[PDB]
């Protein structure tokens, strides 16, 4: 499956993040995975859509929100090829973040993730739509 | 990176698990990912090693222990090709499990994971060694 491997790669680049990561690093990350005309939409029923120029700031904001790790889990995603793009539709999608040492908490935002990738060599994200269902904060036993 | 993609695939097959999964299903899962002469070692400093014939029972035991999900996260794994096998060495390896609805807790066993894969077409696991450092149980805010 060609598409969910792009999300494996996206999760892997986010592992390279340190607290000493430049704004030029987020530009390089975004340029690797997103088209120059990419649109990212978060749905809570308040719907917010950001253009390509803010996608780097979106991902940075999550870490500057306190997060140390960020990875996406896609349970049974449906891949379909179209003339213009490849679609990835996942109802059971999880956005997971590990937070600072003092709090040492994990946030698991569950919802539907819909992605349209360019049907070319780079396989960059054209559309990112995440419709959030549930919001879970897990705290340790210690 | 050829090896950590095998662990992406291993995580993906474990998503297909339901509570109505036969013992023949675990034989099929193990046959996909492990050689017929595979060895699996867990280190806590009590060291236990199981042969190929018990590897299906090991993975089943985790779910029959109450777990609904099981996936492995490998942070910066080192891949090296040798004459006989391909090696995957990950100091920052995480074994993650989501537990039953009543408790609704998540266990995150952290440690070093060392894997030797067959340097052939199937890329099946010859050696599985997981040296556990820390053991974390996360409970929800609700």
């Amino acid at each position: 499956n060609q598409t969910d491997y792009r999300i494996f790669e996206l999760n892997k680049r986010l592992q390279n993040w340190t607290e000493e990561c430049d704004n030029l690093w987020w530009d390089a990350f975004t340029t690797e995975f997103f088209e120059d005309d990419a649109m990212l939409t978060i749905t809570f029923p308040k719907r917010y859509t950001i253009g390509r120029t803010l996608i780097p700031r979106y991902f940075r904001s999550i870490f500057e929100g306190g997060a140390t790790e960020l990875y996406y889990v896609l349970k049974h995603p449906k891949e379909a090829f179209h003339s213009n793009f490849v679609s990835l539709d996942c109802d059971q999608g999880s956005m997971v973040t590990q937070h600072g040492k003092p709090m040492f908490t994990q946030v698991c935002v569950e919802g539907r993730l819909y992605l349209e990738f360019m049907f070319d060599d780079m396989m960059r994200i054209k559309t990112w739509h995440f419709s959030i269902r549930q919001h879970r904060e897990l705290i340790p036993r210690s």
Side-chain angles (χ1 to χ4, degrees), chain A:
Chain A
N1 210 59
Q2 302 187 35
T3 37
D4 49 33
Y5 176 70
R6 297 294 293 116
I7 302 303
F8 165 76
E9 284 179 306
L10 184 140
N11 286 342
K12 216 203 195 301
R13 286 305 296 249
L14 290 170
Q15 286 174 2
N16 297 340
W17 175 89
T18 67
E19 202 175 26
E20 294 278 305
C21 269
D22 202 352
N23 283 16
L24 274 290
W25 189 89
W26 285 113
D27 283 340
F29 168 84
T30 308
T31 302
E32 189 180 349
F33 289 112
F34 296 88
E35 282 292 298
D36 301 326
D37 61 341
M39 305 295 288
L40 190 147
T41 303
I42 307 295
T43 286
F44 293 93
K46 295 179 177 178
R47 182 177 64 78
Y48 294 90
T49 300
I50 68 177
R52 171 56 174 78
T53 48
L54 280 185
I55 288 177
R57 200 170 300 166
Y58 168 74
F59 284 110
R60 192 197 310 134
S61 81
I62 304 172
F63 290 84
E64 294 190 338
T68 58
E69 303 291 327
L70 166 61
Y71 64 91
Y72 297 86
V73 186
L74 303 179
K75 182 92 150 61
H76 302 300
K78 307 198 168 189
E79 183 187 57
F81 292 83
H82 310 268
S83 55
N84 297 325
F85 59 94
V86 185
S87 54
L88 194 62
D89 197 352
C90 184
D91 284 341
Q92 298 175 244
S94 299
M95 174 174 185
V96 182
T97 45
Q98 280 184 30
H99 273 299
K101 294 178 179 179
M103 280 326 307
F104 178 71
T105 180
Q106 166 167 321
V107 187
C108 171
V109 183
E110 303 183 342
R112 179 187 163 186
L113 183 70
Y114 181 77
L115 299 173
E116 298 174 336
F117 297 81
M118 282 304 304
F119 184 28
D120 65 21
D121 201 46
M122 299 181 82
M123 276 268 209
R124 293 204 300 180
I125 296 160
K126 194 173 143 200
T127 306
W128 179 299
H129 190 203
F130 189 45
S131 307
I132 295 169
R133 285 193 200 81
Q134 295 151 314
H135 190 295
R136 293 158 169 188
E137 304 186 15
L138 309 184
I139 303 163
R141 211 186 175 187
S142 67

